[model samples]
Target chain A: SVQIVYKPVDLSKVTSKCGSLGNIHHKPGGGQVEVKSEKLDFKDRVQSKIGSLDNITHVPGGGNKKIETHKLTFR
Target chain B: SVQIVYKPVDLSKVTSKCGSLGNIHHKPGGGQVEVKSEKLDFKDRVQSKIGSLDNITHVPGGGNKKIETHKLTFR
Candidate 1:
């Protein structure tokens, strides 16, 4: 995993008297923040919020089963 | 901006009797985790976590400024 840590600028000291008109809005400050990447588990890697299982078929003699997996699309 | 939040697996209930021999290791449980991408500021976008500035020159008169910008490569 990789972690990114940095001291953010103090936004309270910022003003709106300089730049373009679109910059005249106020933004909330986040005191301290860190971004980290984590490892995914087997179940999480297999399941998807945008996918479904279909066309599941089983044999009456109980030998093996077949399942259809859909394409997972994430935007 | 984008955010990915999910309830992590309960590692306390996990055991070492799994499939591969490399899976016989214990992992710490993180109850809940969130990953968020924040917007960068002007200074942050210009600066680099792995870069340096060099060859800065002055004209000694009232004129345009000359500076050298380095290539920032981040892993």
Candidate 2:
């Protein structure tokens, strides 16, 4: 049987350094590299849309009817 | 196929209807109709449990470990 070469898994790859530049490994044809650092503005929806009324996407005992509270089920 | 009597679909029949003896539909055999009126509300989720925390369900750039920021991808 013939053996193929594979890159060893790196732990630092998780904390930083994406596979190549897109957090991926080995490009196909493009030799371009791009760096990304995302920053998000912290905001709350609970006090925004309804302003204390909360989002009623779902409710535990509320089915077949629009939920009247912000209790969206994970499912 | 002969065209049976068809009541025009009214948008108001849905938007402003749906309560008390069920604010919906026209009976065929009962020869009875129900009318209703309803009011809706608006709300939000900002300044909510989603505030100041990483909330990405399945992050591509970050995974395995717990996220410390709020970033739920639209997709």
Best by DockQ: 2
Model 2 chain B — which ten-residue stretch has the worst lDDT? Answer: B9-18
Give me the runs in candidate 2 sitting further than 4 Å from their true place: A1-17, A20-75, B1-60, B66-75
lDDT of 2 by residue, B1-75 (tens): 222221222121101221222112221122222223234232434342211122111113222232122221211
User: What is the per-residue lDDT of model 1 for residues B1-75, given as tens digits with 9 covering 90 to 100?
Assistant: 433332222211111111111112211111232343344223222322211112122211112222222222233
Q: What Cα-based lDDT does every candidate model obtain?
A: 0.22, 0.23
- Residue clash pairs of candidate 1: none
Task: Determine the TM-score of chain B of model 2.
Answer: 0.13
TM per candidate comes to 0.12, 0.12
Candidate 1, residues A2-70, lDDT tens digits: the string is 333322222121111211111122112112323543442332222221111121211111112222222
lDDT of each residue in A1-75, candidate 2, tens digit only = 322232222122112222321221221212222222244343344343111122121111111212111211221
Error of 2 at A4 (Å): 54
Q: Tell me the deviation in Å of residue A23 in model 1.
A: 12
